[PDB]
């Protein structure tokens, strides 16, 4: 059975069928360089039932720089890499049966042993045996999914082949859309018109079913294919034969399987199917294919890789590429620069690219065994040539090996760049899975290891949890509840002992700005954000903009992800993005007119919070502000209009004292929610009630509710009452036992319980579909007189002790099962949905929606983060604007799109002068320096006349204010009212426009120092 507490986030991505398929999955992987290790780690974290790892080579000292598990002892013993890393990888997932193999692979090797596996992955392999294995796997029934990948220096290759036909069960991870129909005409084809406030959001050739249609009742359950007519209409085929349309109707998306056809590896070398990652250079992947095949031919011919700076090797590789290109169908021009750089960096191994392509290959393997997403077809190539391109024409001494744990990276990037990386001071905020793997990548890269400067700073307030163990791979079950930053640091010293790292347990926010002051920011070089929210991103971006430091960011949403690059004096900031504010469910919709499952889920969540978090806190706060019931009685007798005392007394008069009273309170709350409110609403609006135009009131999106009779025999009612009674007894501190939750005891209590009858009322229904949250109805006489009577009777019953006057406040726990919050909210949401004829939702989906849990997987994390690290190298190198590449990806398609980051916009101010966000003007002053002096100094220094000055929220001078010309003569040290915190003050200025009456053109922030 699925371990929900470990796997829920991945479950929300894949679906239970995918994991059930992986419960039977056997996967074989051969070749344990960095790429193979990363792929194996990703697959083990995913939860493949059985993984067979394999290698035939032994640990080199060179291999230590490409591995995060091996040790110098392994090299000394010359242990084979497979079983060497087998020890560590076993800790990742006990549920995974990890095995090992070391059978040498060659032409005479029998491949029949591979029949048990569903997917086979090869790395560092020679091409003819790749071809033979591909022939073997595709000839099996069912064919074995074949994946091959390699990494050479700054270049990588990814190929997949799933046989002649590969079944795809799901083409996209999104839920099937549902659209409310406004009108459908009788025509051939019929014209379907949606509620045209919302767009069609569907495409031609898609498949739909329909339900709850009136007028054309024959379309109930009808199944049609569609063709889009407009962004708000579409056709589904003939409807002329149908009856006339009247009202109602919802179009429901139907998910349809698909089959994608893959060609053999050898035949895919010619006319290769390539996926473009840069639409500005779609020719580049074909060039990379040709160059990689030329490198394979060179390796086949000479049994060695080309040497760095070997002109003969580069010439031979160019000749081979030219010859091979002439055998291709398209015969493109061979990129001599690409060939030269490949020859230069043939022997290197660049770890971040390896991790990224490993994550991509892991997702391809995941697709191969499930059919959950549309797979790559068939070739993919990634590049790091941007880094070397900015180097011009360096020389081999930068890249020659020197015997350390960084020779592989040195052969790629050059020794000086490595020294720059070792001297880097990197501040990382947040320690999610992204933070952990980024720290791992830095350890692999030797970043922040130099004694003089190189330091890595990390901070995070959260503690380790079981659910985080699924993708935050550094941690273990016995690390639970330990600080994330501290444990993550401790794990990384194992990877690299030369690292210099500091860790903190602090949330990053304005209150903690004192620790992370601008002096701390100055000591840093680059800042990396692994946040999960927008406001902290805004705060960090504003701080780094104020401190003029580069910033990088990454967001992950299931198979989708993106990377953001910000460089001073070159790009925009995160606070440039103005993504629209999120949706708000109307108050009327949530309270009275829910049309969707999410509405009922939100209603249940809000009701639970109000009942058990908000109201108990209000009760405790009221009985902390006021101490005696008799004192409150004396106050209200003297006309004190105390706030919420009526509701406090109502709650106290309803305070249960034993378990049976708690259960009956739960039952009466059930009645109020599920019969009385529905009856009241239907009393206000009968089923046949109609609008001013005579149209139906209870029509789309207004779904008519229906009252529900209680029945203990119903499992939903049973669970709801059990959870409600447990929660109420927790708040009221009434002790109980698990035997009290038995259906027998509940039946015995219910036989004693009697239910109050419903009564209609004239409470005004806020039908306004744009209605905000209203204010409370004022205290009627009934309220205060009932409050007086009930407090008096409570005093008579002696229910006035501090235990009676205070209750327990329950937090919103969402992951544990014993709290039962998830069960209660699911039961309430299901009841409310059943009221409005809305389909009930399962526990896991309710937990996802109610908890706002982001569906995530470690593979997408590693994929985006490899690119993030790559861009970190470019930021370190100080490359021009062209090098930096913002990127977006959606592995479900799969699709990758590199794009230039947004260029900084020059804010023209006046007379050709302009400023940028990377600008903050300064003026040094003195004690007698005045505001007129400040204005004149600004005019002299920047050639533009100030018009008005403001200190934060506070007006300093405005021309049209009476007698404010005197403020010009006043001195800074007095008018500013400075604090001793700074030598300066920050302020805002605007300047005169060319057209009279236009608002003064805003300039950059201006800082005035009080001294020189």
């Amino acid at each position: 059975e699925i371990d929900d507490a470990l796997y829920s986030r991945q479950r929300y991505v894949l679906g239970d069928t995918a994991m059930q398929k992986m419960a039977k999955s056997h996967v074989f992987l051969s070749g344990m360089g960095g790429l193979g290790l990363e792929i194996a780690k990703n697959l083990v974290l995913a939860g493949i039932k059985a993984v067979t790892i394999h290698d035939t080579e032994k640990c080199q000292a060179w291999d230590l720089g490409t591995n995060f598990f091996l040790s110098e002892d392994d090299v000394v013993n010359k242990r084979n890499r497979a079983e060497a890393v087998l020890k560590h990888i076993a800790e990742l997932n006990p549920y995974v049966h990890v095995t090992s193999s070391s059978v040498p692979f060659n032409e005479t090797t029998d491949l029949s042993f591979l029949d048990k596996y569903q997917c086979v992955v090869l790395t560092e392999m020679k091409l003819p045996l790749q071809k033979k294995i591909n022939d073997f796997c595709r000839s099996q029934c069912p064919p074995i999914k074949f994946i091959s990948a390699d990494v050479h220096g700054i270049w990588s290759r990814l190929f997949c082949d799933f046989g002649d036909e590969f079944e795809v069960l799901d083409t996209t991870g999104e839920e099937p859309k549902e659209i409310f129909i406004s009108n459908i005409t009788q025509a051939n084809p019929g014209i379907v018109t949606c509620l045209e406030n919302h767009p069609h959001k569907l495409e031609t050739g898609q498949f739909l079913t329909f339900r709850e249609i009136n007028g054309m009742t024959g379309l109930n359950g009808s199944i049609q294919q569609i063709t889009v007519i407009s962004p708000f209409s579409f056709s589904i085929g003939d409807t002329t034969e149908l009856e006339p349309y009247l009202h109602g109707g919802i179009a429901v998306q139907v998910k349809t399987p698909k089959t994608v056809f893959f060609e053999s590896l050898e035949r895919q070398l010619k006319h290769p199917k390539c996926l473009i990652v840069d639409f500005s250079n779609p020719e580049a992947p074909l060039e990379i294919h040709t160059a990689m095949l030329a490198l394979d031919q060179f390796q086949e011919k000479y049994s060695r890789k080309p040497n760095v700076g070997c002109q003969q090797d580069s010439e031979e590789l160019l000749k081979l590429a030219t010859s091979i290109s002439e055998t291709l169908e398209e015969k493109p021009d061979v990129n001599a620069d690409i060939v030269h750089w490949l020859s230069w960096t043939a022997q290197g191994f660049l770890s971040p690219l390896a991790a990224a392509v490993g994550g991509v290959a892991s997702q391809e393997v995941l697709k191969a065994v499930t059919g959950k997403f549309s797979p790559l077809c068939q070739w993919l190539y990634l590049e790091a040539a941007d880094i070397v391109e900015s180097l011009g024409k360096p020389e081999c001494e930068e890249f020659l090996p020197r015997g350390d744990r960084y020779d592989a990276l040195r052969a790629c990037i050059g020794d000086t760049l490595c020294q720059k990386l070792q001297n880097l001071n990197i501040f990382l905020v947040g320690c999610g899975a992204i933070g952990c793997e980024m720290l791992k990548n830095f350890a692999l890269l030797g970043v922040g290891t130099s004694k003089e400067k190189g330091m890595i700073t990390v901070t995070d307030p959260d503690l380790i949890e079981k659910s985080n163990l699924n993708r935050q791979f550094l941690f273990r079950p016995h690390h639970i509840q330990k600080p994330k930053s501290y444990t993550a640091a401790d794990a990384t010293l194992k990877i690299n002992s030369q690292i210099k790292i500091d860790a903190h347990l602090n949330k990053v926010c304005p209150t903690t700005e004192t620790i992370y002051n601008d002096e701390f920011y100055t000591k840093q070089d680059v800042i990396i954000t692994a946040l999960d929210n927008v406001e902290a991103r805004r705060y960090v971006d504003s701080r780094c903009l104020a401190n003029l430091r580069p910033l990088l960011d990454s967001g992950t949403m299931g198979t989708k992800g993106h990377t953001e690059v910000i460089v001073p004096h070159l790009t925009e900031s995160y606070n440039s993005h103005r993504d629209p504010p999120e949706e708000e469910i109307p108050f009327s919709t949530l309270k009275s007119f829910p049309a969707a499952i999410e509405h009922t889920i939100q209603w249940a969540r809000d009701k639970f919070e109000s009942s058990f978090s908000h109201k108990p806190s209000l009760f405790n706060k009221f009985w902390q502000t006021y101490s005696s019931a008799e004192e409150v009685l004396q106050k209200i007798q003297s006309g004190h209009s105390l706030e919420g005392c009526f509701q406090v007394i109502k709650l106290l008069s309803r305070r249960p004292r034993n378990w049976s009273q708690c259960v009956e309170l739960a039952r009466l709350k059930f009645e109020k929610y599920f019969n009385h409110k529905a009856l009241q609403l239907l009393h206000c609006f009968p089923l046949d009630i109609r609008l001013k135009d005579g149209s139906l009131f209870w029509q789309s999106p207004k779904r008519p509710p229906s009252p529900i009779k209680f029945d203990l025999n119903e499992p939903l009612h049973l669970s709801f009452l059990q959870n409600a009674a447990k929660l109420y007894a927790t708040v009221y501190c009434i002790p109980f036992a698990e035997e009290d939750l038995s259906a027998d005891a509940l039946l015995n209590i219910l036989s004693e319980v009697k239910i109050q009858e419903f009564k209609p009322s004239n409470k005004v229904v806020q039908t306004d579909e744009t209605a905000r949250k209203p204010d409370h109805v004022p205290i009627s006489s009934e309220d205060e007189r009932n409050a007086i009577f009930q407090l008096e009777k409570a005093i008579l019953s002696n229910e006035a002790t501090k235990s009676d006057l205070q209750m327990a406040v329950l937090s919103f726990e969402k992951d544990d099962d014993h709290n039962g919050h998830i069960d209660f909210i699911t039961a309430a949401s299901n009841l409310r949905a059943k009221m409005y004829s809305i389909e009930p939702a399962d526990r896991f989906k309710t937990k996802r929606i109610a908890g706002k849990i982001i569906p995530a997987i470690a593979t997408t994390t590693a994929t985006v983060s490899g690119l993030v690290a790559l861009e970190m190298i470019k930021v370190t190198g100080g490359y021009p604007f062209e090098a930096y590449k913002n990127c977006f990806l959606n592995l479900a398609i799969p699709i990758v799109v590199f794009t230039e980051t947004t260029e900084v916009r020059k804010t023209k101010i006046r007379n050709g002068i302009s400023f940028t966000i990377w600008d903050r003007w300064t003026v040094h002053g003195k004690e007698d320096f005045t505001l007129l002096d400040f204005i004149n100094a600004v005019k002299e220094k920047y050639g533009i006349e100030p018009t008005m000055v403001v200190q934060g929220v506070k007006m300093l001078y405005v021309p049209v204010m009476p007698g404010h010309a005197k403020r010009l003569k006043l001195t800074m040290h007095k008018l500013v009212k400075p604090t001793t915190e700074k030598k300066y003050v920050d302020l805002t200025v605007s300047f005169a426009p060319d057209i009279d009456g236009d608002e003064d053109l805003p300039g950059p922030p201006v800082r005035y120092y009080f001294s020189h």
């Binding site: 403001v950 506070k954 007006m955 009212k977 805002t988 605007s990 003064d1000 805003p1002």
Partner: protein, 293 residues
Amino acid sequence: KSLEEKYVAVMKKLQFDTFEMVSEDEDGKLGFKVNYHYMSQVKNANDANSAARARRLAQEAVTLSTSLPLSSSSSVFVRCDEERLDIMKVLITGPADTPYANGCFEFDVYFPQDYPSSPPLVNLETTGGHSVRFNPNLYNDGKVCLSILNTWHGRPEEKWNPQTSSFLQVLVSVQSLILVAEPYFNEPGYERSRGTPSGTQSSREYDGNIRQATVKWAMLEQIRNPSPCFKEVIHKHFYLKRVEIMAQCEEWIADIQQYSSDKRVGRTMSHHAAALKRHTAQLREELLKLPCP
């Protein structure tokens, strides 16, 4: 007849000005020198002030100082803290023929951080103990209901617009929609009661109640307990309007007695007439006492 021209000429110097609201030590401990509605929210606002907010406020201040509405019937008075911006206060004179005729109404206005994204918060403080629902759009607590403020029913075009809407338009809408001769019909369903003697009679009751409440608070309490912000201005206004105040109150006494002819609603009109006569005697004492300021 030159009274109107002198009224316009004199108080145009008094329409737009600043008066000091915030009181602090050098440590920034926030206090306030007068009564204001949003004391806590001034201290609880975020200090990462957006430059767009300040520039919009300055431009609006210029626009008001250049184009404030001004007539003895209906006028707008602008005062703001001399140091801070988002804290705001207005004074509005009720047009003629209305139950608010020639009364004055002080308002408290606050501007949020996101401004101009959202309309400024507006609330009337002249409700007199916050018990008089002076308008269907102005409840007892003083809440202001207007479409442009997103506090009243209407179309999105009638509602707030961060780019096109201006506070001067809000003030004009207040003058044109709130201080009206038919406030009873402002509530939905009462404009439907128009054309019937019952609706007109209920309007008589409501308008007489509003008349007496205005005479009580908007004139008598505004002169006997003036806010220091508009203290001198309101005294000058009522000094210049003292003759028409007497004429208007005598006319209201005569007219409210016409409504008093009815048996039951005329009894409520008699109560309002007694209150009106009491407050008229008090205001007449004040007018006799009040010299040229």
